[PDB]
Amino acid sequence: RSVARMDGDVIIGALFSVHHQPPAEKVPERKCGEIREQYGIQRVEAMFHTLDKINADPVLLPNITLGSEIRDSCWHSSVALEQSIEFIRKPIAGVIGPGSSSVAIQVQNLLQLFDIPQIAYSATSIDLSDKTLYKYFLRVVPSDTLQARAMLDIVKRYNWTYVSAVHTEGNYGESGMDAFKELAAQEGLCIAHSDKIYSNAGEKSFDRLLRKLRERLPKARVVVCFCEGMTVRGLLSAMRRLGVVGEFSLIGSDGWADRDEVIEGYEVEANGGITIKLQSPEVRSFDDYFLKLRLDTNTRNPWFPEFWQHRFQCRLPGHLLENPNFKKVCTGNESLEENYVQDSKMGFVINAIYAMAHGLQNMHHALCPGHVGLCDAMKPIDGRKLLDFLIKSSFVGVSGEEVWFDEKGDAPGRYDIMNLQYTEANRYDYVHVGTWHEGVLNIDDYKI
Amino acid sequence: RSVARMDGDVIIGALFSVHHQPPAEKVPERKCGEIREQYGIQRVEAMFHTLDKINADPVLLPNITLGSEIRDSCWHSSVALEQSIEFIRKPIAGVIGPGSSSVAIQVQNLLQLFDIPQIAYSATSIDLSDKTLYKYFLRVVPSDTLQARAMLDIVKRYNWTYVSAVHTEGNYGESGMDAFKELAAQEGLCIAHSDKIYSNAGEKSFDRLLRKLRERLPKARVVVCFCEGMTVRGLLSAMRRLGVVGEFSLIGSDGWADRDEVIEGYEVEANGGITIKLQSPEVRSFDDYFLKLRLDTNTRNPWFPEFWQHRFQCRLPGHLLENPNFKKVCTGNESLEENYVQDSKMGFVINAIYAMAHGLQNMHHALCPGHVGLCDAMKPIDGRKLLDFLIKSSFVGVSGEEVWFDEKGDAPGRYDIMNLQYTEANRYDYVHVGTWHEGVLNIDDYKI
Numbered sequence: 001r002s003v004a005r006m007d008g009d010v011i012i013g014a015l016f017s018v019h020h021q022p023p024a025e026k027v028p029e030r031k032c033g034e035i036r037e038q039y040g041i042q043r044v045e046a047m048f049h050t051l052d053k054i055n056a057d058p059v060l061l062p063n064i065t066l067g068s069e070i071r072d073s074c075w076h077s078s079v080a081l082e083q084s085i086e087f088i089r090k091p092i093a094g095v096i097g098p099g100s101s102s103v104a105i106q107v108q109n110l111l112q113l114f115d116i117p118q119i120a121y122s123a124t125s126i127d128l129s130d131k132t133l134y135k136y137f138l139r140v141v142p143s144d145t146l147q148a149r150a151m152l153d154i155v156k157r158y159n160w161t162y163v164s165a166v167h168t169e170g171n172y173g174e175s176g177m178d179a180f181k182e183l184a185a186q187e188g189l190c191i192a193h194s195d196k197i198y199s200n201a202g203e204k205s206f207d208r209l210l211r212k213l214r215e216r217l218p219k220a221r222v223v224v225c226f227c228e229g230m231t232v233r234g235l236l237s238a239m240r241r242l243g244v245v246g247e248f249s250l251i252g253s254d255g256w257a258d259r260d261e262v263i264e265g266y267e268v269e270a271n272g273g274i275t276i277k278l279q280s281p282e283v284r285s286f287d288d289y290f291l292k293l294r295l296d297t298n299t300r301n302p303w304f305p306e307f308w309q310h311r312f313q314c315r316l317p318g319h320l321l322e323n324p325n326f327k328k329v330c331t332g333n334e335s336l337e338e339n340y341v342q343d344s345k346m347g348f349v350i351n352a353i354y355a356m357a358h359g360l361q362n363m364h365h366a367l368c369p370g371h372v373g374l375c376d377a378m379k380p381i382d383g384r385k386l387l388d389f390l391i392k393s394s395f396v397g398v399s400g401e402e403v404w405f406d407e408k409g410d411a412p413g414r415y416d417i418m419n420l421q422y423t424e425a426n427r428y429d430y431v432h433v434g435t436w437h438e439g440v441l442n443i444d445d446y447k448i
Numbered sequence: 449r450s451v452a453r454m455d456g457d458v459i460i461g462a463l464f465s466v467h468h469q470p471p472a473e474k475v476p477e478r479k480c481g482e483i484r485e486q487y488g489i490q491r492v493e494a495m496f497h498t499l500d501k502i503n504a505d506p507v508l509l510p511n512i513t514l515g516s517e518i519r520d521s522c523w524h525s526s527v528a529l530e531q532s533i534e535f536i537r538k539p540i541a542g543v544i545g546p547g548s549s550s551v552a553i554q555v556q557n558l559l560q561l562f563d564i565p566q567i568a569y570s571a572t573s574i575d576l577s578d579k580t581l582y583k584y585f586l587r588v589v590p591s592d593t594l595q596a597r598a599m600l601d602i603v604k605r606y607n608w609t610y611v612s613a614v615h616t617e618g619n620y621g622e623s624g625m626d627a628f629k630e631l632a633a634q635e636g637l638c639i640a641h642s643d644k645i646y647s648n649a650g651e652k653s654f655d656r657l658l659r660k661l662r663e664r665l666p667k668a669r670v671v672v673c674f675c676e677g678m679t680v681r682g683l684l685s686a687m688r689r690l691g692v693v694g695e696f697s698l699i700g701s702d703g704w705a706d707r708d709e710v711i712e713g714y715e716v717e718a719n720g721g722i723t724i725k726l727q728s729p730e731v732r733s734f735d736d737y738f739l740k741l742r743l744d745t746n747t748r749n750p751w752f753p754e755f756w757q758h759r760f761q762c763r764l765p766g767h768l769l770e771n772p773n774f775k776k777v778c779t780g781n782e783s784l785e786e787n788y789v790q791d792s793k794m795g796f797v798i799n800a801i802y803a804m805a806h807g808l809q810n811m812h813h814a815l816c817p818g819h820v821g822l823c824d825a826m827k828p829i830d831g832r833k834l835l836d837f838l839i840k841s842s843f844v845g846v847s848g849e850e851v852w853f854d855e856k857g858d859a860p861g862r863y864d865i866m867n868l869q870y871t872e873a874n875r876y877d878y879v880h881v882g883t884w885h886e887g888v889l890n891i892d893d894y895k896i
């Protein structure tokens with residue numbers, strides 16, 4: 001239910017976490033949480049926006065219009081699987097996403113049965129590099145074999161020999177932590193306390209988690225978290241309910257990154273943190289499209305009305321999706337510019353789309369030479385063949401990056417190290433302090 | 449392709465590993481290995497056999513005939529998922545199986561979307577006890593929280609303080625080993641070398657695995673293997689290619705059990721082993737049905753012809769499934785009694801069927817009172833309601849055991865400890881040496 005569509009000649013499906021995951025007690029009936037912006041609306045919009053550009057470009061896919069069938073994943077293998085069934089009930093050419101790795105594996109375990117190439121933008125698990133199990137998977141981001149290596153170089157940087165380790169329950173935090181503990185054993189690094197926890201677990205689960213970490217103090221101060229954002233938020237939420245501040249040195253994975261929605265409200269118990277982030281320049285182009293949107297003109301995005309209400313804390317009279325948590329009426333002229341922050345991985349969301357465009361491009365030059373539009377060869381489009389063209393593609397990203405894939409569907413990349421600190425002004429922000437590229441760790445010591 | 453059917457009023461689907469899993473290079477095209485007997489043909493036969501009995505019984509389901517749609521799983525999440533799609537393309541009332549835990553989770557992640565109760569007979573992972581993720585799952589066997597506890601009591605029994613740990617890649621060996629290492633940390637037991645490996649990995653993978661284990665010698669002799677049978681077989685296969693005998697003390701999980709197909713051919717490098725086995729008396733009834741089968745009269749089991757050939761190393765002239773590995777022609781009067789060994793879990797395969805029968809029984813007494821057959825209430829049969837009746841069922845097993853479920857779909861059980869040794873005669877066999885029931889470990893010391 002609730003699907004964002006756009007008709008054309010070649011349809012490209014996509015899964016985006018429009019809402020949060022269903023509470024533990026609602027999983028069976030599959031009722032998703034609340035509306036999301038960074039990981040939801042912004043991605044659905046960046047989907048249409050990119051397509052308009054590609055369908056307006058004379059070089060990329062001359063007389064071929066790309067359509068799209070976007071579906072909500074709610075960041076959960078169950079709902080994401082419910083929607084994938086819809087994709088296989090014009091046929092789909094391929095799928096963009098989903099977000100999580102555990103959710104990606106699920107969707108992949110199905111799509112591969114119907115020969116449908118899948119390209120991710122945030123799934124970074126090493127397990128997906130195995131092409132014997134996930135033949136139809138590829139991504140515009142590098143696996144975590146490099147991130148785990150980066151995180152260890154940070155621990156060796158400040159001579160921390162005794163650290164705790166916490167990861168989010170799921171194929172992401174686990175596959176990443178195992179690679180870390182494997183490199184930690186070779187380096188002679190001792191793991192103090194080890195634990196795991198879901199992202200939707202009750203506060204009591206975090207109370208027990210936080211307590212088990214404090215018991216290892218003061219020798220075990222540094223805490224490595226190959227964790228999702230909501231997992232780090234829950235931990236900071238427990239640090240509040242208990243009344244503890246500055247007792248740990250948190251070092252999180254890309255799940256944290258420079259995301260402002262993770263530490264929003266808990267800047268205090270979050271200060272002094274060091275994080276990891278896939279190098280992705282903020283797309284200058286998207287801000288011009290998104291900020292100009294209006295509740296009256298935007299009609300192709302079904303979840304917009306629900307978004308606008310929760311976005312400005314107002315309700316839409318008589319509307320079906322009328323929010324019963326606010327009482328003041330929406331004017332319809334509010335500015336999205338207030339408290340606006342672009343999706344940290346917005347750049348990858350776009351190149352994942354271009355990777356699908358050029359894929360159909362090289363295939364057209366090979367199967368339908370000289371022709372203008374789709375020919376007998378690309379009717380219908382063969383998925384098994386499209387997979388080969390995708391892997392054999394290379395182009396210049398939306399922001400100027402180099403995009404190509406290897407034999408494992410993995411793409412090259414690098415990281416930027418962030419340090420959350422209180423600036424000269426009354427504000428907490430993520431400061432650019434360092435980078436990591438091919439075993440090289442350059443950290444600015446006077447900035448921390 | 450190739451489906452075993454039986455028509456009736458209420459159809460019960462089931463997944464059995466008729467063939468082995470596809471080699472690593474054949475997973476994408478989903479081409480299964482060779483025919484299986486213990487985990488394949490015997491279970492398909494035990495399926496029909498039990499149904500004939502239930503449909504011949506006057507008390508259990510009076511005038512209601514149970515049918516069945518059996519499908520091959522090849523013991524692989526991909527093929528098992530391909531077949532589940534067929535189940536949801538008369539409708540199915542529920543599903544029996546599959547075998548592995550990782551494969552069970554896959555099938556469960558789909559069936560729960562269409563409200564179809566699933567009952568296993570060999571899936572023992574602790575993860576399946578979570579009813580928020582697998583609401584429609586239940587089993588006639590207890591989770592491994594008890595087996596891991598049992599294996600540790602065996603290590604403490606002989607005062608082994610330094611042991612190695614190996615498990616099969618997958619939700620089974622992992623969820624089981626983590627529970628072991630958790631209890632090992634509390635007991636102050638040190639884990640020497642730790643490793644993991646798939647069951648279909650190349651011999652080189654086992655050569656490297658075996659080598660990494662020998663390097664920890666002689667202090668690390670005892671080896672705990674929460675491993676599948678084929679994983680233990682591969683290890684013994686490497687012990688052969690290297691020329692090592694009696695260097696370890698292997699202690700395996702139920703994946704090994706008293707199975708003769710695991711150590712067949714490698715009795716030498718397998719002697720002196722101690723295993724775990726779910727208490728399940730060998731069904732006296734099945735042997736009378738199976739051994740009397742004939743290649744000419746058995747027509748409801750499609751995979752029989754293929755089985756008979758590989759069973760007696762002969763080929764069927766002109767037949768479609770003609771085996772091109774043998775040259776001598778099948779007489780058709782060969783006895784299945786030669787080298788016959790009943791499936792170790794044959795008892796659970798049957799009660800899983802009875803658990804489905806009584807489920808439809810209590811539901812009939814409640815929704816269609818007084819009626820003879822199915823009424824307006826059970827047309828069609830509601831899966832969500834059938835789930836409640838199943839959980840609230842209790843009966844006497846085919847061999848006299850107590851069968852009932854708790855709020856987590858788990859069933860009570862106990863284990864028998866086995867010791868593989870060379871008897872007085874020129875033969876290697878699994879000897880009954882002990883039992884484990886509710887924290888109590890009774891091991892006969894003079895029998896080992």
Ligand SMILES: N[C@@H](CCC(=O)O)C(=O)O
Nearest residue numbers: 100101122123124172255
């Ligand atoms: N890299 C994480 C997702 C990080 C995020 O987008 O928050 C994963 O593959 O599960």
Ligand SMILES: N[C@@H](CCC(=O)O)C(=O)O
Nearest residue numbers: 548549570571572620703
């Ligand atoms: N208990 C194992 C299966 C053991 C076997 O049947 O060989 C599992 O749940 O994966």
Ligand SMILES: [Gd]
Nearest residue numbers: 174178622626
């Ligand atoms: Gd693990």
Ligand SMILES: [Gd]
Nearest residue numbers: 258260429430
């Ligand atoms: Gd910022």
Ligand SMILES: [Gd]
Nearest residue numbers: 706708877878
């Ligand atoms: Gd025996």
